[PDB]
Design a protein around this ligand. Sequence first.
Ligand SMILES: [Co+2]
Length: 150
Amino acid sequence: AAMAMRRIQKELREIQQDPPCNCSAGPVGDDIFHWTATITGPDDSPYQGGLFFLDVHFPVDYPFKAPRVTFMTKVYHPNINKNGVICLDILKDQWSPALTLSRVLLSISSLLTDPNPSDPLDPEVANVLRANKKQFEDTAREWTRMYARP
Ligand SMILES: [Co+2]
Protein backbone atom coordinates (compact mmCIF):
# COMPACT_ATOMS: atom_id res chain seq x y z
CA ALA A 1 0.00 0.00 0.00
CA ALA A 2 2.65 2.41 1.29
CA MET A 3 4.83 3.56 -1.62
CA ALA A 4 1.72 3.75 -3.80
CA MET A 5 -0.13 5.94 -1.33
CA ARG A 6 2.79 8.34 -0.95
CA ARG A 7 3.07 8.69 -4.71
CA ILE A 8 -0.64 9.33 -5.20
CA GLN A 9 -0.63 11.90 -2.36
CA LYS A 10 2.26 13.65 -4.10
CA GLU A 11 0.37 13.71 -7.40
CA LEU A 12 -2.71 15.10 -5.62
CA ARG A 13 -0.61 17.96 -4.17
CA GLU A 14 0.67 18.62 -7.66
CA ILE A 15 -2.90 18.79 -9.05
CA GLN A 16 -3.71 21.36 -6.35
CA GLN A 17 -0.49 23.33 -6.77
CA ASP A 18 0.33 23.06 -10.47
CA PRO A 19 -2.34 21.29 -12.48
CA PRO A 20 -2.31 20.76 -16.21
CA CYS A 21 -4.26 23.58 -17.81
CA ASN A 22 -7.95 22.89 -18.41
CA CYS A 23 -7.93 19.83 -16.15
CA SER A 24 -9.08 18.94 -12.69
CA ALA A 25 -8.82 15.72 -10.66
CA GLY A 26 -9.21 14.36 -7.18
CA PRO A 27 -10.39 11.42 -5.05
CA VAL A 28 -14.05 10.40 -5.22
CA GLY A 29 -14.36 10.15 -1.43
CA ASP A 30 -11.93 8.89 1.20
CA ASP A 31 -10.14 6.39 -1.07
CA ILE A 32 -7.10 8.01 -2.66
CA PHE A 33 -6.80 5.13 -5.16
CA HIS A 34 -10.10 6.18 -6.81
CA TRP A 35 -10.45 9.57 -8.58
CA THR A 36 -12.66 11.50 -10.98
CA ALA A 37 -10.91 13.78 -13.43
CA THR A 38 -12.00 16.25 -16.08
CA ILE A 39 -10.47 17.56 -19.26
CA THR A 40 -11.87 20.32 -21.43
CA GLY A 41 -12.02 19.46 -25.10
CA PRO A 42 -8.95 20.83 -26.89
CA ASP A 43 -9.43 24.10 -28.76
CA ASP A 44 -9.57 23.85 -32.57
CA SER A 45 -10.98 20.31 -32.50
CA PRO A 46 -14.52 18.85 -32.73
CA TYR A 47 -14.43 18.48 -28.96
CA GLN A 48 -13.79 22.15 -28.18
CA GLY A 49 -15.92 23.56 -25.35
CA GLY A 50 -16.89 20.14 -24.02
CA LEU A 51 -16.24 18.99 -20.47
CA PHE A 52 -15.16 15.35 -20.39
CA PHE A 53 -15.35 13.31 -17.15
CA LEU A 54 -12.91 10.46 -16.60
CA ASP A 55 -12.83 7.62 -14.02
CA VAL A 56 -9.38 6.83 -12.61
CA HIS A 57 -8.48 3.64 -10.69
CA PHE A 58 -4.91 3.50 -9.44
CA PRO A 59 -3.54 -0.01 -8.86
CA VAL A 60 -2.17 -1.14 -5.50
CA ASP A 61 1.40 -1.03 -6.83
CA TYR A 62 1.18 2.34 -8.57
CA PRO A 63 3.36 3.78 -10.15
CA PHE A 64 4.75 0.42 -11.29
CA LYS A 65 1.59 -0.21 -13.31
CA ALA A 66 -0.67 2.30 -15.07
CA PRO A 67 -3.89 3.71 -13.64
CA ARG A 68 -6.99 2.45 -15.39
CA VAL A 69 -8.52 5.52 -17.00
CA THR A 70 -11.82 5.51 -18.81
CA PHE A 71 -14.29 8.12 -20.03
CA MET A 72 -17.58 8.60 -18.19
CA THR A 73 -18.62 11.13 -20.85
CA LYS A 74 -19.83 9.77 -24.21
CA VAL A 75 -17.30 10.71 -26.89
CA TYR A 76 -17.06 9.97 -30.63
CA HIS A 77 -13.51 8.90 -31.53
CA PRO A 78 -11.88 5.88 -33.20
CA ASN A 79 -9.69 5.14 -30.15
CA ILE A 80 -12.39 5.40 -27.39
CA ASN A 81 -15.22 2.86 -27.33
CA LYS A 82 -18.85 2.96 -26.22
CA ASN A 83 -17.80 1.91 -22.71
CA GLY A 84 -15.25 4.76 -22.50
CA VAL A 85 -12.25 2.41 -22.78
CA ILE A 86 -9.25 4.30 -24.20
CA CYS A 87 -6.68 2.82 -26.55
CA LEU A 88 -3.49 4.69 -25.63
CA ASP A 89 -0.06 3.08 -25.61
CA ILE A 90 1.03 4.71 -22.34
CA LEU A 91 -1.94 3.22 -20.49
CA LYS A 92 -0.77 -0.22 -21.54
CA ASP A 93 2.64 -1.55 -22.54
CA GLN A 94 4.28 1.87 -22.73
CA TRP A 95 3.51 2.86 -19.12
CA SER A 96 6.45 4.30 -17.21
CA PRO A 97 6.57 5.44 -13.57
CA ALA A 98 7.79 8.85 -14.85
CA LEU A 99 4.27 9.41 -16.16
CA THR A 100 1.72 10.99 -13.84
CA LEU A 101 -2.04 11.22 -14.03
CA SER A 102 -1.49 14.87 -15.15
CA ARG A 103 0.69 13.64 -18.04
CA VAL A 104 -1.97 11.01 -18.89
CA LEU A 105 -4.67 13.69 -19.04
CA LEU A 106 -2.43 15.76 -21.35
CA SER A 107 -1.85 12.66 -23.53
CA ILE A 108 -5.63 11.97 -23.72
CA SER A 109 -6.23 15.59 -24.78
CA SER A 110 -3.55 15.09 -27.47
CA LEU A 111 -5.31 11.86 -28.56
CA LEU A 112 -8.54 13.82 -29.07
CA THR A 113 -6.66 16.15 -31.47
CA ASP A 114 -5.24 13.21 -33.35
CA PRO A 115 -8.02 10.72 -34.27
CA ASN A 116 -6.29 7.96 -36.19
CA PRO A 117 -8.44 5.43 -37.93
CA SER A 118 -5.57 3.08 -38.91
CA ASP A 119 -5.54 1.02 -35.67
CA PRO A 120 -8.83 1.78 -33.95
CA LEU A 121 -10.58 0.51 -30.83
CA ASP A 122 -13.98 1.35 -32.40
CA PRO A 123 -13.76 0.20 -36.00
CA GLU A 124 -17.12 1.65 -37.01
CA VAL A 125 -16.18 5.15 -35.88
CA ALA A 126 -12.88 4.68 -37.72
CA ASN A 127 -14.79 3.71 -40.88
CA VAL A 128 -16.64 7.06 -40.78
CA LEU A 129 -13.40 9.03 -40.22
CA ARG A 130 -11.49 7.27 -43.03
CA ALA A 131 -14.38 7.56 -45.50
CA ASN A 132 -15.44 11.16 -44.79
CA LYS A 133 -13.37 13.19 -42.34
CA LYS A 134 -15.82 16.07 -42.34
CA GLN A 135 -18.66 13.71 -41.46
CA PHE A 136 -16.65 12.32 -38.56
CA GLU A 137 -15.87 15.82 -37.30
CA ASP A 138 -19.52 16.88 -37.58
CA THR A 139 -20.63 13.87 -35.55
CA ALA A 140 -17.87 14.38 -33.01
CA ARG A 141 -18.98 18.01 -32.67
CA GLU A 142 -22.64 16.99 -32.29
CA TRP A 143 -21.74 14.46 -29.59
CA THR A 144 -19.72 17.12 -27.79
CA ARG A 145 -22.76 19.37 -27.84
CA MET A 146 -25.20 16.66 -26.79
CA TYR A 147 -23.21 14.73 -24.23
CA ALA A 148 -20.32 16.84 -22.91
CA ARG A 149 -22.03 20.01 -21.60
CA PRO A 150 -20.56 21.07 -18.22
CO1 LIG B 1 -14.47 4.56 -10.70
